[PDB]
Amino acid sequence: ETWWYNPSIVVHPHWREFDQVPDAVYYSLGIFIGICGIIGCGGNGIVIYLFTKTKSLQTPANMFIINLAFSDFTFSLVNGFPLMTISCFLKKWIFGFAACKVYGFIGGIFGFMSIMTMAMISIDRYNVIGRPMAASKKMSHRRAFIMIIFVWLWSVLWAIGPIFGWGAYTLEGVLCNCSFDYISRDSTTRSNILCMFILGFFGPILIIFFCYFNIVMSVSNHEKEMAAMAKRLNAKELRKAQAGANAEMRLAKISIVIVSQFLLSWSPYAVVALLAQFGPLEWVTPYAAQLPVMFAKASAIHNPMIYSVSHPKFREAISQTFPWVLTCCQFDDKETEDDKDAETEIPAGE
Numbered sequence: 621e622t623w624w625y626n627p628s629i630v631v632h633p634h635w636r637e638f639d640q641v642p643d644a645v646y647y648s649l650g651i652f653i654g655i656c657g658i659i660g661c662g663g664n665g666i667v668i669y670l671f672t673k674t675k676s677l678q679t680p681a682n683m684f685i686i687n688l689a690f691s692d693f694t695f696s697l698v699n700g701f702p703l704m705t706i707s708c709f710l711k712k713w714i715f716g717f718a719a720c721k722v723y724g725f726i727g728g729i730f731g732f733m734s735i736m737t738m739a740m741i742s743i744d745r746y747n748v749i750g751r752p753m754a755a756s757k758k759m760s761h762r763r764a765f766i767m768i769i770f771v772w773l774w775s776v777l778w779a780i781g782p783i784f785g786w787g788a789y790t791l792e793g794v795l796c797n798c799s800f801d802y803i804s805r806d807s808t809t810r811s812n813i814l815c816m817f818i819l820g821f822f823g824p825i826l827i828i829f830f831c832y833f834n835i836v837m838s839v840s841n842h843e844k845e846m847a848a849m850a851k852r853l854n855a856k857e858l859r860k861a862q863a864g865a866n867a868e869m870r871l872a873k874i875s876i877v878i879v880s881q882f883l884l885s886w887s888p889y890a891v892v893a894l895l896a897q898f899g900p901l902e903w904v905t906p907y908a909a910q911l912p913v914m915f916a917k918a919s920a921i922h923n924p925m926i927y928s929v930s931h932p933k934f935r936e937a938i939s940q941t942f943p944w945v946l947t948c949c950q951f952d953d954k955e956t957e958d959d960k961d962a963e964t965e966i967p968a969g970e
């Protein structure tokens with residue numbers, strides 16, 4: 621009678637008026653997300669393993685990185701295999717409503733968690749690079765720990781709504797994965813959506829911009845400052861300080877790329893969702909929603925690869941532990957030089 625009926629979840633009428641996408645599409649979708657499961661869990665596992673165990677990567681701020689990897693690891697695990705991948709190969713989410721809720725809720729909770737964690741990372745960047753060298757402040761375990769606690773509370777807060785009726789996680793697109801209902805336009809649903817977008821998304825974004833734009837509108841504040849202290853009878857020991865700023869700067873740059881990655885990955889889907897809740901629902905087709913959600917889902921598998929091609933200490937560790945990964949990205953000692961000088965302290969003028 622129908623090719624979309626789910627005896628465990630009521631499919632919104634909107635996704636029911638369409639025809640059922642070809643088998644090949646379901647199979648590809650399954651294989652696709654499954655491979656995000658592998659790369660995602662694999663790569664984030666590696667960052668969690670190496671960062672918690674390498675001596676070099678032992679500073680408080682790195683906790684954010686670990687927190688981000690835990691976030692992306694779980695996203696990739698829960699959102700790929702087996703909940704979605706298996707659903708695809710059968711062309712039906714066979715894991716019932718509760719699974720669906722857990723799935724959608726986990727997806728939202730860690731998507732909110734990866735940007736907010738990046739926000740905390742953008743803050744650390746601002747304290748070490750965004751403020752004047754004289755006031756430069758490094759991350760402390762105390763601060764860091766409190767910050768991630770905020771991250772977790774925050775993330776759960778803006779994602780748990782649909783768990784209590786203030787919105788809802790249900791099926792979308794080809795009905796083989798779960799998400800938050802962006803179709804239904806009632807007061808309740810719409811407020812939760814507005815909350816998700818503004819508190820969950822725009823929020824950490826402001827923190828990010830305010831921190832990076834603050835690091836940019838300080839490159840010169842630092843440019844001058846570097847000189848004033850430079851000619852300040854500061855011996856060749858000035859090089860040390862310089863290397864440190866380079867080293868930190870590089871990390872700050874990294875931060876921005878992963879943030880860019882996040883935004884480029886989610887914004888599309890975000891947009892398609894808003895059209896469905898505020899614009900021509902007739903646009904949000906099976907593929908209009910599906911394809912942009914896959915692009916979003918894979919977001920949680922990028923940071924680890926970004927780190928492996930631009931994070932020196934991390935790249936060092938990999939060469940020393942799972943060095944096979946660094947094949948096409950060969951390691952070398954020169955990549956760690958700026959970190960060497962930045963810490964090779966000088967004994968009383970030396």
Ligand SMILES: *C/C=C(C)/C=C/C=C(C)/C=C/C1=C(C)CCCC1(C)C
Pocket residue numbers: 699724727728729731732735797798799800816817820821886887889890893913917
């Ligand atoms: C298949 C994965 C799903 C359905 C993910 C659910 C994710 C959320 C509810 C994410 C919320 C958002 C962000 C983390 C940033 C971009 C904009 C939002 C509000 C859609």
Ligand SMILES: CCCCCCCCO[C@@H]1O[C@H](CO)[C@@H](O)[C@H](O)[C@H]1O
Pocket residue numbers: 679680681682685741744758867868871872874875959
């Ligand atoms: C890419 C995400 C950026 C996270 C920034 C990681 C912050 C680590 O920055 C680290 O600070 C240490 C000071 O205790 C320095 O010794 C390290 O060289 C520097 O890489």
